[PDB]
Design an enzyme around this catalytic site. Sequence first.
Site, short mmCIF file in Angstrom:
data_model
loop_
_atom_site.label_atom_id
_atom_site.label_comp_id
_atom_site.label_asym_id
_atom_site.label_seq_id
_atom_site.Cartn_x
_atom_site.Cartn_y
_atom_site.Cartn_z
N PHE A 60 0.89 -1.18 0.00
CA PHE A 60 0.00 0.00 0.00
C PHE A 60 0.91 1.21 0.00
O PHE A 60 1.95 1.28 0.73
CB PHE A 60 -0.91 -0.03 1.25
CG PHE A 60 -1.95 -1.10 1.19
CD1 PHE A 60 -1.59 -2.47 1.31
CD2 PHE A 60 -3.28 -0.76 0.95
CE1 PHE A 60 -2.57 -3.51 1.20
CE2 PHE A 60 -4.26 -1.79 0.81
CZ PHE A 60 -3.91 -3.15 0.96
N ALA A 61 0.56 2.21 -0.82
CA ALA A 61 1.35 3.41 -0.84
C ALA A 61 0.38 4.60 -0.93
O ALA A 61 -0.05 5.01 -2.01
CB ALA A 61 2.36 3.39 -2.01
N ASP A 128 5.24 -3.88 4.15
CA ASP A 128 5.23 -2.42 4.19
C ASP A 128 6.12 -1.90 3.04
O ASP A 128 7.09 -2.57 2.65
CB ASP A 128 5.85 -1.95 5.51
CG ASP A 128 4.84 -2.03 6.72
OD1 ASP A 128 3.67 -2.39 6.53
OD2 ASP A 128 5.32 -1.66 7.80
N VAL A 129 5.81 -0.67 2.60
CA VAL A 129 6.47 -0.11 1.42
C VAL A 129 7.73 0.74 1.76
O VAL A 129 8.60 0.91 0.88
CB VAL A 129 5.46 0.74 0.62
CG1 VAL A 129 5.23 2.08 1.34
CG2 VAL A 129 6.00 1.00 -0.83
N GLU A 220 -1.11 -5.19 13.67
CA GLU A 220 -0.07 -6.12 14.15
C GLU A 220 -0.56 -6.92 15.39
O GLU A 220 -0.26 -8.14 15.57
CB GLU A 220 1.19 -5.36 14.50
CG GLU A 220 2.33 -6.22 14.95
CD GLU A 220 3.60 -5.40 15.02
OE1 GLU A 220 4.36 -5.38 14.02
OE2 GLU A 220 3.85 -4.77 16.09
N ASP A 243 16.19 -3.68 10.88
CA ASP A 243 16.31 -2.20 10.89
C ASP A 243 17.74 -1.98 11.35
O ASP A 243 18.03 -2.06 12.57
CB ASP A 243 15.30 -1.68 11.89
CG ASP A 243 15.21 -0.16 11.91
OD1 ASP A 243 16.18 0.49 11.49
OD2 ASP A 243 14.11 0.32 12.31
O1 LIG Z 1 0.33 7.50 5.48
C1 LIG Z 1 0.53 6.27 5.29
C2 LIG Z 1 0.79 5.42 6.38
C3 LIG Z 1 1.21 4.11 6.11
N1 LIG Z 1 1.01 3.52 4.88
C4 LIG Z 1 1.24 2.07 4.66
O2 LIG Z 1 1.13 1.34 5.88
C5 LIG Z 1 2.39 0.83 6.27
C6 LIG Z 1 2.44 0.95 7.79
O3 LIG Z 1 2.92 2.21 8.16
P1 LIG Z 1 4.50 2.41 8.39
O4 LIG Z 1 5.28 1.37 7.62
O5 LIG Z 1 5.04 3.74 7.95
O6 LIG Z 1 4.60 2.26 9.99
P2 LIG Z 1 5.84 1.54 10.77
O7 LIG Z 1 5.26 0.40 11.55
O8 LIG Z 1 6.94 1.08 9.90
O9 LIG Z 1 6.44 2.59 11.65
C7 LIG Z 1 3.39 1.63 5.43
O10 LIG Z 1 4.58 0.94 5.09
C8 LIG Z 1 2.66 1.83 4.14
O11 LIG Z 1 2.76 0.60 3.47
C9 LIG Z 1 0.77 4.33 3.77
O12 LIG Z 1 0.74 3.84 2.62
N2 LIG Z 1 0.53 5.71 3.99
MN LIG Z 2 6.99 0.51 7.91
#
Ligand SMILES: O=c1ccn([C@@H]2O[C@H](COP(=O)(O)OP(=O)(O)O)[C@@H](O)[C@H]2O)c(=O)[nH]1
Ligand SMILES: [Mn+2]
EC number: 2.4.1.40
Length: 262
Positions: A60-61, A128-129, A220, A243
């Site tokens: 998702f992006a 995640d993207v 999660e 990471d």
């Molecule tokens: O504004 C946003 C927030 C998140 N996502 C999607 O949801 C995932 C989960 O959010 P993110 O990876 O930034 O959170 P993390 O757990 O890595 O801090 C992202 O990788 C994206 O794939 C997105 O497309 N737009």
């Molecule tokens: Mn992420």
Amino acid sequence: FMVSLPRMVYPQPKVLTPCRKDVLVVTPWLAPIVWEGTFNIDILNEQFRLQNTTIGLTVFAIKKYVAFLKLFLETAEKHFMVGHRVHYYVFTDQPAAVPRVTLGTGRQLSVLEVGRFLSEVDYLVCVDVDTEFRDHVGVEILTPLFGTLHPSFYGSSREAFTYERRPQSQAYIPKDEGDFYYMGAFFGGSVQEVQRLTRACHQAMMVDQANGIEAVWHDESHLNKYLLRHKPTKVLSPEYLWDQQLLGWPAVLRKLRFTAVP
Ligand SMILES: O=c1ccn([C@@H]2O[C@H](COP(=O)(O)OP(=O)(O)O)[C@@H](O)[C@H]2O)c(=O)[nH]1
Ligand SMILES: [Mn+2]
Ligand SMILES: [Hg+2]
Ligand SMILES: [Hg+2]
Ligand SMILES: [Hg+2]
Ligand SMILES: [Hg+2]
Ligand SMILES: [Hg+2]
């Protein structure tokens, strides 16, 4: 139906030599835990290629996250399922902002606008993207249902896991339950099993919302509840979503395969 493997020449497995003496390589329900040193990728490639396996990779992006797609896709091209049929599915609010990335033969990309999988692919991988591939991620992961060890928790006792702890939430797991803490950022399986999982999480989240409660780590938390009660048939080690900025490169990781981007 599975055709025979061809003749292959490779090192004999050694029954009286452990693959690894530093880590657990099989769960108590006899699912492999996928670390470098456990698998012969030539054998696995043969097995999956003979099945003409197609892998769907879903990302998702939305909003600012379209910025991550170029590095994500370019690196997937170098490292993700190379030699096999891949179909990327990019779910985005900005179809025209998806970067034009050159794909290898047998690899395709669909843009789905947001506000079928069963006929098109054999396995679905959901990631995640804001990430990039740095080393091989291949057919060794494929199985009916897998989760990935969260890099902050792989050495933690279950009481430290950040599961949802309120009994009022469908995602609740008490302090005396739990095998692992799985990452929301990288899971997958057969299309049928991934759709089972996402249907179950979606229903549980609706129940929570009707009840005025939101699980502590959202999707999660619900993934961890599901994988507690429906054991994955493979578990990926933290090689598979690391990471490096937060966590460095510890001796237990022989490869850093897919990583969070700063
Ligand atoms: O504004 C946003 C927030 C998140 N996502 C999607 O949801 C995932 C989960 O959010 P993110 O990876 O930034 O959170 P993390 O757990 O890595 O801090 C992202 O990788 C994206 O794939 C997105 O497309 N737009
Ligand atoms: Mn992420
Ligand atoms: Hg081994
Ligand atoms: Hg998915
Ligand atoms: Hg769930
Ligand atoms: Hg959900
Ligand atoms: Hg889920």
